[PDB]
Amino acid sequence: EVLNIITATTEIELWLEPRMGVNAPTGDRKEWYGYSEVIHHADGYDNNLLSVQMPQYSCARVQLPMLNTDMTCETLMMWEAVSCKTEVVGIGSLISVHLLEAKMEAGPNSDGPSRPIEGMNYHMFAVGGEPLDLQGIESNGQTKYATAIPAKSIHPNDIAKLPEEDKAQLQGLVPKAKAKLDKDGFYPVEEWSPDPSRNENSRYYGSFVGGLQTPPNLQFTNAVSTVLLDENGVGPLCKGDGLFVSCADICGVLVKADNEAIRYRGLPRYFKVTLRKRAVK
Amino acid sequence: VEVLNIIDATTEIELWLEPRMGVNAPTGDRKEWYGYSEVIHHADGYDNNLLSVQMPQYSCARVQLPMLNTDMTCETLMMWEAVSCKTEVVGIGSLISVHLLEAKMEAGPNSDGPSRPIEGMNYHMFAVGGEPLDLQGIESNGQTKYATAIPAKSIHPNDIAKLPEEDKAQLQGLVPKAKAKLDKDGFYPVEEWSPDPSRNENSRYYGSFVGGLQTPPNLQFTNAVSTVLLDENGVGPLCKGDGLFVSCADICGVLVKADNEAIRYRGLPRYFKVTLRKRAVKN
Amino acid sequence: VLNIIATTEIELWLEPRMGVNAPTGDRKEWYGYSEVIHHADGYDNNLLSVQMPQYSCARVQLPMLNTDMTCETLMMWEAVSCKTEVVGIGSLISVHLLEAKMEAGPNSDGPSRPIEGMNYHMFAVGGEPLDLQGIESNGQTKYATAIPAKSIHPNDIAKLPEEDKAQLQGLVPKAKAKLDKDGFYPVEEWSPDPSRNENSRYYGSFVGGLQTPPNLQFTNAVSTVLLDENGVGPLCKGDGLFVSCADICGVLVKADNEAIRYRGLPRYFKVTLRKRAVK
Amino acid sequence: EVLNIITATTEIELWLEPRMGVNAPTGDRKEWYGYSEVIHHADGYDNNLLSVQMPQYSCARVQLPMLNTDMTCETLMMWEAVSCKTEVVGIGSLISVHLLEAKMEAGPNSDGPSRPIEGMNYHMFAVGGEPLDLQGIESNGQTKYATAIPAKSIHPNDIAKLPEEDKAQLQGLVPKAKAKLDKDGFYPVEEWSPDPSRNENSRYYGSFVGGLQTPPNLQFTNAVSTVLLDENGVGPLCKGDGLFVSCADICGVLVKADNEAIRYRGLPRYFKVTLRKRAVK
Amino acid sequence: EVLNIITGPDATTEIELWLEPRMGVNAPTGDRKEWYGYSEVIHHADGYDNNLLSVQMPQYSCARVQLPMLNTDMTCETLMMWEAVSCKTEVVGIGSLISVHLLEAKMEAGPNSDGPSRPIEGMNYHMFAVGGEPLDLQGIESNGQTKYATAIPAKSIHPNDIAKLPEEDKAQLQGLVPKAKAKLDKDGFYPVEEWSPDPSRNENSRYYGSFVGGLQTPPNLQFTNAVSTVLLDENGVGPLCKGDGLFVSCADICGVLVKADNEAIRYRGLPRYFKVTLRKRAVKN
Ligand SMILES: CC(=O)N[C@H]1[C@H]([C@H](O)[C@H](O)CO)O[C@@](O[C@H]2[C@@H](O)[C@@H](CO)O[C@@H](O[C@H]3[C@H](O)[C@@H](O)[C@@H](O)O[C@@H]3CO)[C@@H]2O)(C(=O)O)C[C@@H]1O
Ligand SMILES: CC(=O)N[C@H]1[C@H]([C@H](O)[C@H](O)CO)O[C@@](O[C@H]2[C@@H](O)[C@@H](CO)O[C@@H](O[C@H]3[C@H](O)[C@@H](O)[C@@H](O)O[C@@H]3CO)[C@@H]2O)(C(=O)O)C[C@@H]1O
Ligand SMILES: CC(=O)N[C@H]1[C@H]([C@H](O)[C@H](O)CO)O[C@@](O[C@H]2[C@@H](O)[C@@H](CO)O[C@@H](O[C@H]3[C@H](O)[C@@H](O)[C@@H](O)O[C@@H]3CO)[C@@H]2O)(C(=O)O)C[C@@H]1O
Ligand SMILES: CC(=O)N[C@H]1[C@H]([C@H](O)[C@H](O)CO)O[C@@](O[C@H]2[C@@H](O)[C@@H](CO)O[C@@H](O[C@H]3[C@H](O)[C@@H](O)[C@H](O)O[C@@H]3CO)[C@@H]2O)(C(=O)O)C[C@@H]1O
Ligand SMILES: CC(=O)N[C@H]1[C@H]([C@H](O)[C@H](O)CO)O[C@@](O[C@H]2[C@@H](O)[C@@H](CO)O[C@@H](O[C@H]3[C@H](O)[C@@H](O)[C@H](O)O[C@@H]3CO)[C@@H]2O)(C(=O)O)C[C@@H]1O
Ligand SMILES: [Mg+2]
Ligand SMILES: [Mg+2]
Ligand SMILES: [Mg+2]
Ligand SMILES: [Mg+2]
Ligand SMILES: [Mg+2]
C-alpha cells in the first residue's frame, strides 16, 4: 500500500557488460568476449546448442542505502525509481570493415572490406524494484541443448518440465514456463521474454529488428531521460533496498569467412537511475 | 565564419491469445509445427486445394464479466465499459534464431552458414470490443480452390456471399454480402477477412502490415504504454451481455524450407490487460 | 462563409479502378488489377486504358438544405472530418498468387512473389470535383484511341502539336481537368492540382520501386480533420459531397514473361458534416 | 532594424519547373526535358562533365507591389513572408514501368517491366527576401567541367579561383567558394548547398536519400503549411519588394537499357506564399 | 554551484564556426592530398596482415572557442560564466552525395556496361556536441588485438594507450574497461571506431548521435536553417564554459566510396557548421 512521498533523493550509476555467450575474457575463447560462439544452421539438430552460442540477458542488483532501522514498524520508507538515463556505448566501433576472420564483402578475386556488423538488433533495458519476470518460449520445441553440470544457462522446459513429446507446446504460450531474471548471463534471449502478465513493479522497453543483413540503427545522446512513474505517479519500489537493472543489446552479427557462419555482437550499456523516498504501509 | 580546426466499480481483465497460424494445436501429425502454418507453394490452391492449415487465422476470445443487472428490462442498465488496454506480443527474442529446424541456409552452397531467420511479411492487429469484431471478406484470387472439410476448419467469404462460381471475381473488390462476425477462434483466414470499417461501432481495432518475403521484422515490446479505448465522446466499448471480446493476429514472418524453398508463416502469442469501469445507459 | 448553424454522417465504398474496372467481360477474372504492362508498351504498341490505374471518385447526394436557392443567405453542408480505411490488407500476405512468378531458384517449389513494389495512396474529400494537373513521364507515349474514350490524357485537353509534347514532361498550365468521371483519369498522368482545390482536402503518399515491401495501416480509431486554418471545411456545392481516392498496393509479377499487373484495394469513407450558413 | 507589424496582406502563387540539365523542351535534347543528360562512371575524368549532366537549382524572383513612396524615409514598409504551402506535382507519373529506353527489370529471355524511376532523392525548397546564399563544394576536386562562352553553369572554383594543384581544398570547406542563387538552372546541386553561415533572411528545408535503387518516398497534400517566422516572430523581409523562391526536386534516376547509364528525373514544384506588411527602420 | 542568470542588454552572445571533417586524410597537402575529406583505403585484413594507419580511421573533429572574458578577477567568490543555451548545426555539401561519376569508384552496372559509379552509401555516423569543457570519451575495441601503426609522434591515440592493459588482456576492451577514458582534447586524433562519448561523465556537455550501419545503406540526411537544439538540462541549465572556453566537436561519416580495382573502400565525411547562443550565468566560487 503506497503512501505519500517524503520530501531524500539519490542517484546510482552502473555499467552492464554484454553477455553474448562468450561471457569472460578468459580461456581459449578469450578473444571473442562480447561475441557469441559460432552458430550454424543445423546446430541444435545435429549437435547440442551450447550456452556460449546463445546470447543472454545482463542483470545486476544495486544495494541502496538502508532506510528503516526497524522492519516491524507499520509505516516504512522505500526507495522509488523515478527516472533513468541509459546508453549503449561503443556504437562507433560498428563502422569497422576489418573484422578479424570476417567474410569479405567483394568479388572472389578482389581485396575489399569485410562485412561489417549487421543484421538482427535486439535491444531491451529494464529497471525495477525486484527481479524482472520472464516468460519462456521455444522457436523449435525439440531444439537439443547441452547439459553442463553445473548448468551454464536455463531453458523454459527446465522449469515447465513437459514430457519430450509435448515440447511443441513451448512454441506457443506455456504458463508454467516462467522465471525471474535472477542471474546474469544465464537466461537466453531466444527463449525468454519480459513477462507482460507480471512485472507490476518493473518498467521495461524493448525493440527488435530482424534479418541477417539489416543495417543496424542506433542512437546515442545524454539529453534524454525515461520517466519510470506509472499512470498513478508511482515508480518501481525497491524491495529489500535493492535496485534491479537488466538489459540485452545484440547489435548484429559477424559472418565468418571460412564457413559463412555467424557470431552475435553485443555492446555494453550504461544506467543512471534517480530515486526518491516514498512512504508505504 | 572561420574553419576552427584548420591544420467493484472498476476491474482489470487479463488473458493470452495463442497464435492460430494454421497448425492450431500441438496435437496430431502436425504437432511439431504448432504456432506455424503448413507449407505453402506458389501453385497451391491452383493445382491442389489450399488447406485451412495453410492459412493463418484470427485469434479471438470472449471473457465473461460479472453480471450487472438482475432485471434486463429496466429502462436504465449498467454496462461494463472498456477504458484502456495494454497488449504485448511475447517471445520476440526467439526471432533471432539462425538455427531453425529444416530451414534454408543463408550462405553459399559449399558453406556451413546460418539458417535464414524468420523474416518477411508482418501482419499485426489487435481489437477490443463489447461484441464480436465485424469482418469484411475479400479474395486476392476469386477462383482459389479451398479444401472441403467435414467438419469445416475455416470459413471463406463465398460460403456467405454464395456467389455463382463464375461470378467469384467480384470478391476481388468489395462484395457487401461477404460479411461475418469474428465469432470463432482459429477459423477466419487473415488473407480473406479484414476488420469491417463500415461496422465495428462498439469495437476498437489497430492493425499494421509490412509485406514482402525478406523484409526485416520490426517489433517492439514494453509494459509502459497503454491504448485508450474511449471514442471522441469519451465512451469506450460497452460490453453487451457482460461479455468482453478480444481479437488479434500476429504473423511475424516466414520460415523458408531448405528442401524446396517453400514457406511457413510464424506467429507469436499476444497478452491483453483491459481496464473497465461501469456506465449507466438507456435501454 | 458565415457561421455554423444540425449534423449528419455519410458512408460509402469506392471500389478500385486499376484498369480492369468491372468483374465482367473477357478480363473479368483480373478485376481489381491492371492489365499486364511490359517495358516497351506505349512504344512498340499503344498503351491501353486497362493498363493504366485510375482515380476512383463518386458524388454523394446530400439532403437538400434550402427551399429557395434565390435567397442571399443559404445553408451548405460542411465536411468536418472523415474516417477512411483500405480494406483487404490481410489478403496481401498471399504467396500462392495465380500466374505469379515463383520466389525461389529454378529447381525449387517455393512461394510466389507476393504483392509488393510501388504503393500510391491518396484520398480526398471536397465540396466539388477534385482539380487535376496533368503530366507525362514520356511526352511521346502512344495511347490507344477508342470510341468512346475509355480514359482521358493531358494532351487531350492541352492539344499540343505532336512535336511539342515534350512540354508535358514539365508543367503545362493548359493540362488541367476536373476529376468528374470514375475510372477515367490515369494516376500516371494526373495529380491533384495544388494551385486550385481551395474547396477540397487531399492527402497522398507514394513509395516507388518494384520490390519494395508494402507498408499499410488500418484502424477505426483515427480521423482526419478537414477544417482549414480558419476552421472551415469543404462546402458542398449543390448539396453534393465529392470523394476520391487511388490505392495501388503494389504489383503482381507473371511467371511466363515477368511482366506486371498493379493491384488495388477498396477504400471506405465515413464523412461527418454540419450545416454552415454562407453568403 | 525590424519594428512592428502594420495592421495589409497578400498571397503569391507560382510554379518552378525542374532544371535537371535538359532545361527546355527545345533543341536537340528536347525530348528529355525534365531529365538530366546521360551520366557514366568516368564522366568528368576521361571527358568533360556537361551542364546538361548536372541537376541545378530552380529559382525565381516575384515582384511585389511597391510599398514606399520615398526610399529615403527613416521608417519604411516591407513585405514579410509569413507562411507557405508547397507541393511536388506529378508524383503519380513515377509508377510508370514503361519508361522510354529504360532497362528491363526481368531476366534476359523475358518481357517484363522497365525499371521505374528510383534511387537518390534530393528535395529542397526555400523562401527568402533576397537570393539564397550558397556554399560550394566538390566531391572530386579535379573533376573536369566543360567550358562554354557564355557559361551554362558556374562552379565553386570559378569563384574561389584556387590553383589547379590546390583544388582538393574544395573537398572540404573553402569559405571563398560562396555564391548567391541569382540565376535559374545555373548552380549545380552536386556543387552548391544552402549556406548555413548566411541566409539570415531566408528559410530553407531540405532532405536527401541516396543510393541508386532506393525506393523514392514522396508525399503530397494541400492540408499542410510551413510557418516562415523565426524565433522572434519575424519572417523573411522582401528587399526591393522582391520575393525569392528556390527549389530542387530530384526524384530518382532512369537506367538506360543499352549501356545501363542514368539520367536524373525531376518534377515541378508549386508555391503559395502568404505575406503581410511590416515596418522597419 | 550554479546561481541565477544575469539579465542585461549585453548579457548574450553568439558564436559561429565550421569544423572540417577528419576522415583520416586530414589536410589537402602531401602525397594523399587529393583524397582530403576521405579516409585512406581500407581492406578486410588491414590491422591483421599489416598495421592499421591513422589515415584509415575516421576521427572526431573538435575545437575550443575563446569567449569574451567575463571576470576581471578570478579571485572573487561570485563569478560569471557563459552558459550555452541553444545551437543550430548543419552538415553542408549534402547535394554532392548525388554524384555517380566518382573518381576511381566501382561501376554500378553489368560487367560489360558503361553505367554510373556507385554513389556514396553505406554506414553513416553523425554526432555533434557542445560543452563547457572537452567531451569525455570512453574507449572500446571491436577486435582487442587489432594492430595499429606506432608513429613518433603519435598520429592518433587508442584506448589501451591509456588503460595500459597487458597485451594478453586486451580482449577486455571488447567490453567496458573503466580505465579506457580520455578527453576529446585534440582534433583529428581520437578514432570513432575506438572512442564514444562517455555517458558516465559529460555532465557539462550535451551530445547527440546516430548510427546507421552496413555497406550499401542509403544515406538519409536533412538540412535546414529553421531548427535549433536547446541545450538546457532538466533544471534549465546549459553547459557552463570553464575558463571562458566553448567546446564543440562532431563526426560526420556520410558513407563510403568503393574502389573499382580492388572493391576496397574509403569513408567520406562532410563539413559541419555551428551557431551557439550563450548567456551570462552567475556561479559560486
Ligand atoms: C563450440 C565451438 O567450439 N565451435 C567451433 C566450431 C566447432 O568446433 C565445429 O563446427 C564442430 O564441427 O568450429 C569452428 O571452426 C571450424 C571452421 O573453421 C571450419 C571452416 O570450414 O573448419 C573447421 O574444422 C574442420 C577442419 O578444417 C577439417 O580439416 C575437418 O577436420 O573438419 C573440421 C570440422 O568441420 C573448424 O573447426 C566453426 O566456425 O564451425 C569454430 C567454432 O568456434
Ligand atoms: C491487353 C492484353 O490483352 N494483354 C495480354 C497480353 C497481350 O495480348 C500480348 O502481350 C500482346 O502481344 O498477353 C499476355 O499473355 C501473353 C503471355 O502469356 C506470353 C508469355 O510468353 O505469351 C503470349 O502469347 C504469345 C504466344 O505464346 C506466341 O506463340 C505468339 O503467338 O505471340 C504471343 C504474343 O507474344 C501471351 O499473349 C501477357 O502477359 O503479355 C496476357 C495479357 O492479358
Ligand atoms: C551529352 C550527350 O549527348 N550524351 C549522349 C552520349 C554521348 O554522345 C556518348 O556517350 C559519347 O561517347 O551517348 C549516349 O548514347 C550512346 C549509347 O546509346 C551507346 C550504347 O552502347 O551507344 C553509343 O554510340 C556508340 C555506337 O553505338 C557504336 O556503334 C560506336 O559508334 O560507338 C558509339 C559511341 O559509344 C551512343 O552514343 C549515351 O547514353 O551514352 C546518349 C547520350 O545522350
Ligand atoms: C499439407 C501437407 O502435408 N504438406 C506437406 C507437403 C505435401 O505433402 C506435398 O507438397 C504434396 O505434394 O510436402 C512437404 O514435403 C515435401 C518436400 O519435402 C519435398 C522436397 O522436395 O519432397 C516431397 O516429397 C516427394 C518425394 O521426395 C519423392 O520421392 C516423391 O516421388 O514425391 C514426393 C511428393 O512431392 C515432400 O512431400 C512440402 O514441403 O511440400 C511437407 C508439407 O508439410
Ligand atoms: C596507405 C596507402 O597508401 N594505401 C594504398 C594501398 C597500399 O599501398 C597497398 O594496398 C599495399 O598493399 O594501395 C592502394 O592501391 C592498390 C590498388 O590499386 C591495387 C589494385 O589491385 O593495386 C595495388 O598495387 C599492386 C600492383 O598493382 C601489383 O602489380 C603489385 O604486384 O602489388 C601491388 C600491391 O598490391 C595498389 O597498391 C589500394 O587501394 O590498396 C591505394 C591506397 O592508397
Ligand atoms: Mg499482471
Ligand atoms: Mg457504420
Ligand atoms: Mg489557389
Ligand atoms: Mg550568420
Ligand atoms: Mg555521472
Residue numbers in the entry:
A (entry chain C), D (entry chain E): 38 to 44, 48 to 321
B (entry chain B): 37 to 43, 47 to 322
C (entry chain A): 39 to 43, 48 to 321
E (entry chain D): 38 to 322
What does the paper say about this structure?
Polyomaviruses are small double-stranded DNA (dsDNA) viruses with a circular genome of approximately 5,000 bp. All glycan-binding polyomaviruses analyzed to date engage oligosaccharide (glycan) structures featuring terminal sialic acids that in mammals are usually presented either on gangliosides, which are molecules composed of a glycosphingolipid, i.e., a ceramide and an oligosaccharide, or on glycoproteins, which contain mostly complex and branched oligosaccharides attached to amino acids during co- and posttranslational modification steps. These sialylated glycan structures interact with loop regions at the outer margin of the major capsid protein VP1, at the apical surface of the polyomavirus capsid, as revealed by X-ray crystallography and cryoelectron microscopy. The VP1 surface exhibits an astonishing plasticity, providing virus-specific interactions for a range of Neu5Ac linkage types and further specific characteristics of Neu5Ac-containing glycans.
NJPyV VP1 specifically engages Neu5Ac that is α2,3-linked to galactose (Gal) with a novel binding site that differs in location from the sites in all other structurally characterized sialic acid-binding polyomaviruses. NJPyV VP1 binds the α2,3-Neu5Ac-Gal motif of 3′SL in a binding site that is located between the HI and BC loops of one VP1 monomer. The DE loop, which is elongated in NJPyV VP1 compared to other structurally known polyomavirus VP1 pentamers, is not involved in any interactions with the glycan. Instead, side chains of residues K296 and N299 from the HI loop and residue H80 of the BC2 loop engage the Neu5Ac carboxylate group. Residue E77 interacts with the Neu5Ac C-4 hydroxyl, and the N-acetyl group forms a water-mediated hydrogen bond with the backbone of residue V78. Additionally, hydrophobic interactions between the N-acetyl methyl group, residue L90, and the hydrophobic part of the E77 side chain are seen, but the Neu5Ac glycerol chain is facing into solution and is not engaged by VP1. The Gal ring interacts with residue D298 via a hydrogen bond formed to the C-4 hydroxyl and via hydrophobic interactions of its C-6 atom. Like most polyomaviruses, NJPyV VP1 does not undergo any rearrangements upon glycan binding (root mean square deviation [RMSD] of 0.2 Å for the structural superposition of native and liganded NJPyV VP1 Cα atoms). In our crystal structure, Gal forms fewer interactions than Neu5Ac and contributes only about 30% of the total interface area buried upon 3′SL binding. In the NJPyV VP1-3′SL complex, the Neu5Ac ring is positioned roughly in between the locations seen for JCPyV VP1 and TSPyV VP1, defining a novel polyomavirus Neu5Ac-binding site.
